[PDB]
Design an enzyme around this catalytic site. Structure first.
Site, PDB file in Angstrom:
ATOM      1  N   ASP A 125       0.840  -1.233   0.000  1.00  0.00           N
ATOM      2  CA  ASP A 125       0.000   0.000   0.000  1.00  0.00           C
ATOM      3  C   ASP A 125       0.877   1.288   0.000  1.00  0.00           C
ATOM      4  OD1 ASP A 125      -2.098   1.746   0.593  1.00  0.00           O
ATOM      5  OD2 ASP A 125      -2.340   1.071   2.602  1.00  0.00           O
ATOM      6  N   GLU A 166      -2.584  10.180  -1.419  1.00  0.00           N
ATOM      7  CA  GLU A 166      -3.723   9.270  -1.420  1.00  0.00           C
ATOM      8  C   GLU A 166      -4.253   9.077  -0.037  1.00  0.00           C
ATOM      9  OE1 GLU A 166      -4.375   5.992  -0.138  1.00  0.00           O
ATOM     10  OE2 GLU A 166      -6.179   5.614  -1.253  1.00  0.00           O
ATOM     11  N   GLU A 167      -3.379   8.924   0.959  1.00  0.00           N
ATOM     12  CA  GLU A 167      -3.830   8.594   2.306  1.00  0.00           C
ATOM     13  C   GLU A 167      -4.373   9.796   3.099  1.00  0.00           C
ATOM     14  OE1 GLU A 167      -4.322   5.506   3.210  1.00  0.00           O
ATOM     15  OE2 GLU A 167      -2.677   4.222   2.619  1.00  0.00           O
ATOM     16  N   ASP A 213      -3.640  -0.956  -6.438  1.00  0.00           N
ATOM     17  CA  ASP A 213      -3.554  -0.635  -5.023  1.00  0.00           C
ATOM     18  C   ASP A 213      -3.648  -1.908  -4.172  1.00  0.00           C
ATOM     19  OD1 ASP A 213      -3.416   0.757  -2.717  1.00  0.00           O
ATOM     20  OD2 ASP A 213      -5.308   1.917  -3.017  1.00  0.00           O
ATOM     21  N   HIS A 295      -3.116  -1.495   6.724  1.00  0.00           N
ATOM     22  CA  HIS A 295      -3.012  -0.371   7.646  1.00  0.00           C
ATOM     23  C   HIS A 295      -2.506  -0.782   9.034  1.00  0.00           C
ATOM     24  CE1 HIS A 295      -5.506   2.776   5.223  1.00  0.00           C
ATOM     25  NE2 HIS A 295      -4.468   2.298   4.562  1.00  0.00           N
TER      26      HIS A 295
HETATM   27 ZN   LIG Z   1      -3.621   2.652   2.706  1.00  0.00          ZN
END
Ligand SMILES: [Zn+2]
Length: 326
Positions: A125, A166-167, A213, A295
């Protein structure tokens, strides 16, 4: 003219057995691992030293290739829950004036977490997606170099996008996610393409957005998310099946295949959203379920599966070549 509709009729030029064998042999997972992936396995949230280093690593790796890649940095400022930050999308484009591009993408930022002992490096990720795009570039370099040559082909070429930001910094929200992608899709929407045209934007020029992703976990399963890309998704299934049948995939069973017939109940928020809402077709190569390690500090190199990524490299490279008729 009808050029923006050409993507609706565009067909792959399907590779034969010996060509498939050639592509499978041409990609090196150990190489990718050492030269493309490892340098990215670092903390790289916006403004961090690692953000700079990652962007430098991405650019250098593309620059060493023979193919005619034109690099731009789409750098901008946004407010965030931590205060104003700079973001920089990396766009790498072959034939920037071709009206149409097949576009591959992923995000190169890593999510911010305070250290546990441990540091979040977002291996799946999305360090691995980044590396997969760079290995693709490398493995396909000679075939891509032919696109430099002009003629009897559609006005179609390749672009890579590595999105920043993105995050979410804090909780995911419409305003705290997709900094890079929200910015870039708005820029592209407002920019004439080709230059000097009336009506058409760079978004019309995007044949298909192939967004990688969360790739790198063992036994991923990818839903076929969207009817308007479903024919292209079915190509990934066919390529998978055929590479499997020819003995070109490792540690791979039909029962354990990646690309699935079923769709997905909900709506996944990702870098494709700002493109998708403006009508860009999307092929979203994110698995469901997400990796176990998602995550979590365990989204690291040790929990990656080499043969999976290798196999996925082969399938993606074939797909891209078939799309581009190379
Ligand atoms: Zn992520």
């Amino acid at each position: 003219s009808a050029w923006p509709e050409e993507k609706n009729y565009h067909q792959p030029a399907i590779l034969n057995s010996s060509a498939l064998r050639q592509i499978a042999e041409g990609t090196s997972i150990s190489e990718m691992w050492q030269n493309d992936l490892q340098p990215l396995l670092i903390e790289r949230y916006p403004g961090s030293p690692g953000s700079y280093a990652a962007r430098q690593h991405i650019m250098q790796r593309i620059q060493r290739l023979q193919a005619d890649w034109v690099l731009e940095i789409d750098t901008f400022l946004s407010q965030t829950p931590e205060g104003e930050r700079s973001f920089s999308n990396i766009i790498s484009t072959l034939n920037p004036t071709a009206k149409r591009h097949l576009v591959l993408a992923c995000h190169y930022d890593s999510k911010y977490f305070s250290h546990w002992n441990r540091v979040f490096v977002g291996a799946t990720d999305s360090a691995v997606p980044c590396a997969m795009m760079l290995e693709l570039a490398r493995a396909l370099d000679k075939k891509l170099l032919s696109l430099k040559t002009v003629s009897s082909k559609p006005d179609l070429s390749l672009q890579l996008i590595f999105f920043d930001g993105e995050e979410a910094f804090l909780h995911w929200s419409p305003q705290d996610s997709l900094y890079g992608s929200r910015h870039l899709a708005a820029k592209m929407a407002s920019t004439p393409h080709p230059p000097g045209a009336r009506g058409t934007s760079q978004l019309h020029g995007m044949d298909l957005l192939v967004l990688l992703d969360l790739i790198g976990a063992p036994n991923p399963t990818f839903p076929n998310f969207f009817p308007n890309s479903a024919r292209w998704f079915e190509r990934l299934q066919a390529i998978e099946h055929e590479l499997h049948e020819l003995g070109l995939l490792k540690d791979h069973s039909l029962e354990g295949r990646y690309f699935q017939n079923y769709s997905y109940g909900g709506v996944i928020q990702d870098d494709h959203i700002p493109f998708l809402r403006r009508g860009v077709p999307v092929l979203h190569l994110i698995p469901s379920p997400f990796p176990e390690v998602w995550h979590t500090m365990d989204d690291n190199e040790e929990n990656l599966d080499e043969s999976t990524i290798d196999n996925l490299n082969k399938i993606l490279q074939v797909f891209v070549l078939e799309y581009l008729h190379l």
